[PDB]
Symmetry: D2
Amino acid sequence: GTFLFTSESVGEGHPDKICDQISDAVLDAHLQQDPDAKVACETVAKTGMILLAGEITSRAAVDYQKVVREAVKHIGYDDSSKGFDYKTCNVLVALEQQSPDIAQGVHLDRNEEDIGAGDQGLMFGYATDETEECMPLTIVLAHKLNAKLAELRRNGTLPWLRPDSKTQVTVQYMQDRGAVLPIRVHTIVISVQHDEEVCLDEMRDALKEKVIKAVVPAKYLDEDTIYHLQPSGRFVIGGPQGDAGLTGRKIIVDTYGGWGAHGGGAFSGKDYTKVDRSAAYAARWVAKSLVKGGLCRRVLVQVSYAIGVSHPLSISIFHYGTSQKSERELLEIVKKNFDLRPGVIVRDLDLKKPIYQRTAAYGHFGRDSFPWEVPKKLKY
Amino acid sequence: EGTFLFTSESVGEGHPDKICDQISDAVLDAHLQQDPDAKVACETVAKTGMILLAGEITSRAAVDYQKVVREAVKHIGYDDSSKGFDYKTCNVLVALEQQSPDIAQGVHLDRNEEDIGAGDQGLMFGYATDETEECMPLTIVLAHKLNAKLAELRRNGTLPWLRPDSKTQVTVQYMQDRGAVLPIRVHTIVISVQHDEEVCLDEMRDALKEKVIKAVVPAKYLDEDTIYHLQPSGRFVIGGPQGDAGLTGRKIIVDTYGGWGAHGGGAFSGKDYTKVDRSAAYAARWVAKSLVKGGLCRRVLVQVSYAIGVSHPLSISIFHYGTSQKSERELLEIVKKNFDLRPGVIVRDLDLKKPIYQRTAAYGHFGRDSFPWEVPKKLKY
Amino acid sequence: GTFLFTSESVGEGHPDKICDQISDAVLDAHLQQDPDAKVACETVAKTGMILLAGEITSRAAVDYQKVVREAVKHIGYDDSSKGFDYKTCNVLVALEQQSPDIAQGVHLDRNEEDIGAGDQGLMFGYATDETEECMPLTIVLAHKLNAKLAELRRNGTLPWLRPDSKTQVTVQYMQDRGAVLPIRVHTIVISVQHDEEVCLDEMRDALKEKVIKAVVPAKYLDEDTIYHLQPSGRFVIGGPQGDAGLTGRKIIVDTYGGWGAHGGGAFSGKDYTKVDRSAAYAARWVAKSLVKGGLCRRVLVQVSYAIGVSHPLSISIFHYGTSQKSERELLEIVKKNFDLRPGVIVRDLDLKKPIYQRTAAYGHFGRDSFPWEVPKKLKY
Amino acid sequence: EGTFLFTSESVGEGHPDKICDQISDAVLDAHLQQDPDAKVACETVAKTGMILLAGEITSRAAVDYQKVVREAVKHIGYDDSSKGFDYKTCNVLVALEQQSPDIAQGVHLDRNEEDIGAGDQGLMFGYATDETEECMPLTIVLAHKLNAKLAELRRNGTLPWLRPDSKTQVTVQYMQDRGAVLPIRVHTIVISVQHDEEVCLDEMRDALKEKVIKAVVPAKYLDEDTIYHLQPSGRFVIGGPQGDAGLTGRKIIVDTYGGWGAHGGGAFSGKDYTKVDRSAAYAARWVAKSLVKGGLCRRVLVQVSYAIGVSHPLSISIFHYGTSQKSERELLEIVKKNFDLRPGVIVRDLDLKKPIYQRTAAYGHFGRDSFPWEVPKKLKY
Ligand SMILES: C=[S@@](CC[C@@H](N)C(=O)O)C[C@H]1O[C@@H](n2ccc(=O)[nH]c2=O)[C@H](O)[C@@H]1O
Ligand SMILES: C=[S@@](CC[C@@H](N)C(=O)O)C[C@H]1O[C@@H](n2ccc(=O)[nH]c2=O)[C@H](O)[C@@H]1O
Ligand SMILES: C=[S@@](CC[C@H](N)C(=O)O)C[C@H]1O[C@@H](n2ccc(=O)[nH]c2=O)[C@H](O)[C@@H]1O
Ligand SMILES: C=[S@@](CC[C@H](N)C(=O)O)C[C@H]1O[C@@H](n2ccc(=O)[nH]c2=O)[C@H](O)[C@@H]1O
């Protein structure tokens, strides 16, 4: 009665993930000077090139050349020997204003709290008690592996490391009345950009002893665990040189790594008025509140908004059968505790502050200091 | 209760993100029309007056990017500045290089075809549901066919005021039925389509209701409580790349199951078969559909996982939502004895070197005949 | 005892000339909000693309998308049927700050009037009495032909006209003790972008009767004058579609059309602190002052500045033999009347005002309302 | 008096504007190495991390722009981020299209080669002076040879602290001599050359004076009053495309006569022979030099003019500054009976289809042997 499941994650240097950070760094820059800034900023990253295309209406003056390179600096690409240098790369800006047709039917002369929607409902939110982060173990480990890599690369423990990295974790599960119990780690994949000096033997030894065994609890690792460490063999070429990078091409890494469901919208580069991001954060907030409240062990929340309606038009709770209360009993507790109007979400989750660059790497969900990761004490 | 609402969306050929998906696959076809073993990883960016090609391509084939890109834009129908974009005078930048030698020496070099390792890692999903003849969710089927009808009436001349950029949403009320789902009624549908300036909003919403909606949605699903948001934002004169920075792979959920099932994150357009983000996802749909069409289940989800350079998949999973007599473990045995999911053999099983990918870059990759992953395989068990 | 000479000129729609106007429009934008703005803005114009590359340190906030398209609008490219549309073209901005090495050894903590130079001398200035504009007849006519074309295109007299145009005028001269006497027009060339409707016969008739005979004095035209009107035949494809355009690729059109001499520097996109532009305008100012003062009929002025010197290091006057006073008598009158320090030129020629977009077409020299075209009343 | 100062400048291979001139001519060679009848109008743009190709090219020839551009950058010597630019990781955008069909149907289509009309209108000049052996002004000769010596010592390793970007000015005191000019003494010379960080300014100015200046300028021209501005602006660590937006054709005076004679405005690099901006200017130098080298005058200037589509030049002019026994009209008769200035015959007379143009893209196009327009033609009169 077992099954497998697999999730992936990337490091700060992945060309797609570089764009997510640059797009949200641009967003943080405008929100710092203009909390009411409308930002829709995409980023393209190819060899020696960072392009900013999109639409922005803001009272803020932003040094885009500075913001981009400071973001590329923090990721760690600072020399030609690594494939990309924040000091000498090309930065192109093709940013205009928010499209005049999109501005009139969404914002301009609205009363914040009673804005309904210019769009539809979709929007999913997921939570599970298999980890204390209330996230699937597959992606929690996948995120933490890339973070340990960047941790050891910056302090000089493994100076041969380079920013671009990808991981993948397969966990063997067992069903337990809708809930899933992780029993062991089946397969681990690690591919990281490296120096020209270190040999393939020293890397795989370090990836297993200083990274994997430092991140994965030993109770999940046994003699049958499969390790694909540097399976491509060579990996000195990385970053925007090895693959074209685009904002919003890791949305499954950004969310639940395959678990739950996804509507389609990407997060990075969009301010709070994009219901693609604010309501996605809110559904996770509700989902985590239910599991940590003891009202279920697994849950999937879907919030079906409508256009000319501020409140949610339909909330359906899928608890997979992990609750004593029915999937409609929890509905009463949801609306008794949560106000999921879009304009009210920004007030409760404090979505006007510039915190979005920190979300554009290692997952928007499951990490400590985020408003939507602190469960709300439910009253019922 | 047992009832719930579900929503899926779709976009027209003129939507900026689908322009990139279509141009990237037009480039993929041109390299496959000369070099079937092309290694294409083309990404397209679309903004005001600019189409940008970026990525890595290695193929013994000469293609005119300026001509291929502009021929696609012409097909979509942006041919004048009054429509916001014109193929004749738009800027076309090319930042294409060769494929990374580090990736090439660990994916497809020196190996015979049946052992070509995965072009990258990642996870892919396959889904199928008995609620439609084409084994697809009704929400995404109706949303796709709405945009397709819009383009049909625009091109033949029935509604000559239509422009290529369009977007639809379909909300359907469902009922949980022993693990499967039963579509009851269409709750709300939304249609925003680009138009010229000299056609009034009354005539558009009148034609949107009678000539496309009622010509696509079966009458039993519509009643007199379904909400019609026809041209809701207001006026839609400015469309195409002028109003949204479009990128390749920003509509992966539209391309697949409209929110049903699951997604692994991989995009389809601009990638050849060696990228398992596309070929393994096409095989998963082929597996899921042949399961449902074979009577083994009514609703099924199938997952695969790969590693960069490894031929065999890392994992396979089967979930049947409880819509089957057999167990999920038994269904996993039936598929492993019937299918071969290595990215070398999937090519032969699906004819994935033929330049027929630009067709798939709109109205969904799944649920339409002419595609080899849509003709089910007779299982043996 | 005769000879020929030929000059060319272009219209507002020439891809190279489009960039000159865009570069100086950017410059005018910064100078309007910051008179002390340092601008070095190049412009590239290809099919559907306008790229801004360069370096700018300024307190001004400039809408580059607006400034570019307003410039493309005024030139007249406003539809896809013309090859270029200000409404739908691509605008890319790759502008940084003035290079930190270039800023310290030129400006930053200087006293304006007593700045010497970060560069050398060169810089030529020319004047001739063959026209009342004090310019060579070859280029005065070449400029005026393109202007009549744009004049008739805007008022609808010739609606089939399009912005891109090139002209060329060959004048037969006769030497007169160093001075040159124009006697007749030898050869005229006109190539203008046109409609798809008008035939090749109607264009050539209009170019000769409504343009040439309206611009050229009839005393210079006879039955032997050679006309190459639309010699390429077809010209519906023009603007940045037919040829890549770059700032500063018509510097001979910008100055004297072959007469005199040139140092090399282009004008458009550079503020007043670039001695390539300010001193070139000043040499013409002195040159015109000498001829209009009656001190010579033709003159070429060369001002050889030095690095650590504010005043000119050496002024040499070449009057071709058209003066009763020696080429060193005029030197005394020059320094008795002109103060050619670079910081003093901006004060006398009022070079901080945003007037540079008007100079980036039809010639920087020889046109009425410019400070360096009003001769100074000389005292001696 | 009769004396005056004159100044000319030159720039190194690493100067941004000359990088574009060199890359555009590297592209021209690659198309001529396969299709001699190429129609190249390549323009290059260089900025921080970006090389942009833009223009119009029609040639039955496949060239790797990513490789050709980066091979040129490697030759110039920008190979690390510590130098401000690196060919291995720089961005290379390509906006090249086909040549305008309206230009092609009125320049070179269907005509046999001897009647190929001018690729454009314009005016071109040719100059020659007896003040040097190579028939060039001393100011521009010395400025060119200074940059060339800098590159010589940088590449062999004599001064391994040199970087590619450099710029020189040479001011020379002259004397008017019966119409010609006599160089008396070098008044001032200026040298700004890019350098690394760990070499002090004393060692640089010491080497700039003794190892390049005194190795290039004849001793009689230098005395103890010549002003030496060696590294005058201060520090020059940041150079190359990072500190100046470079464009093709922004150094036309450096390419020609350093301010002597005159210029018509046409740039040279990136253009094939059908563009008379280059081929007719090469012929004018060939005419002017063979006049001076033939003893007919000491200083001469020659002008030509063309029209788009007309084979024969519109006008030719001769000015000898009064340095000849014969009249300017008689010199115009001698050249018209000896030379053929149609852009179809100039090709055969100068071997202008051979890919030898990248060599000319630096240190001046005139005044150096190996070039056919520098070997004079024995006149007949
Ligand atoms: C395979 S990459 C995209 C494929 C496409 N660039 C191609 O034409 O092959 C996606 C990610 O796969 C990582 N990778 C791993 C091992 C390797 O040898 N080279 C790599 O590029 C890298 O992080 C990249 O973002
Ligand atoms: C010949 S154009 C540059 C040549 C280069 N584009 C080529 O690959 O041939 C320079 C100018 O020559 C004008 N011209 C005239 C007639 C014609 O039929 N087509 C044209 O492009 C136009 O103004 C252009 O700026
Ligand atoms: C959701 S839109 C994203 C645009 C971007 N986020 C922005 O805010 O600037 C993309 C689609 O939203 C449709 N749309 C509808 C009404 C309108 O006034 N303007 C529009 O752009 C149009 O189909 C477009 O492809
Ligand atoms: C005259 S520079 C034009 C730069 C541009 N006008 C600007 O102001 O940003 C181009 C050349 O000026 C040299 N130079 C010298 C000293 C210095 O501190 N910085 C420099 O860029 C260098 O050779 C460069 O190629």
